[PDB]
Design a protein around this ligand. Sequence first.
Ligand SMILES: O=P(O)(O)OC[C@H]1O[C@@H](O)[C@H](O)[C@@H](O)[C@@H]1O
Ligand code: ALF
Ligand SMILES: [Mg+2]
Ligand code: NA
Length: 219
Amino acid sequence: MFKAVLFDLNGVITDTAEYHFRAWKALAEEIGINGVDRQFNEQLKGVSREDSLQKILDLADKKVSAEEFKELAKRKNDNYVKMIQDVSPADVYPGILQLLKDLRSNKIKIALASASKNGPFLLERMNLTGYFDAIADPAEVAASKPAPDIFIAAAHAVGVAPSESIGLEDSQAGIQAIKDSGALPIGVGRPEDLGDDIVIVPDTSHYTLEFLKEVWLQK
Ligand SMILES: O=P(O)(O)OC[C@H]1O[C@@H](O)[C@H](O)[C@@H](O)[C@@H]1O
Ligand code: ALF
Ligand SMILES: [Mg+2]
Ligand code: NA
């Protein structure tokens, strides 16, 4: 049986992938880059703040100064942080709170494997901090998603091997990070975005402990 579940945050625990998208698109258009649409944004999900900005600049073959790069990432983050101040427990995605309760009942460790430095603030907004056995600090890994380091760190943090873990993700970068960590991925979203080669569910109501067991047994 699996011994840990490693959670992405944005687009898995709550609908904050939408707010990252809207904030990055606003940032891009301010600097004359109009190509950040929903299709392009599939390449930004799971990617660090600085890597996201660089992918947007690269889309436009645009070069900025080191000073302007730092200011742009800070500008987007300040906008995003204002957007999330009113997040509340009512914004937890369907199934997620019950899953956390069921995992703890069954002595399955719970770790956050988020790239977001805003992760702890968001778990507090949603009254979820108490469910987590560990939060892997994304500033501490030497390599961000799609590198597996954050999932390895989340597992290490709860004393479980990646190979004994399930990872939950809504992104391309994060699915690759889980694969390379040794854990079993279960994606949430569209197969057209996340692929046809792992288990994908259409929405988070499907993330029940019953279903994670159903998937783990059929691995
Ligand atoms: O800018 P933050 O809050 O540190 O978030 C980093 C990344 O966190 C990931 O969880 C999101 O999918 C990305 O969209 C985001 O860029
Ligand atoms: F959406 Al994340 F780490 F929370 F990639
Ligand atoms: Mg995500
Ligand atoms: Na709170």
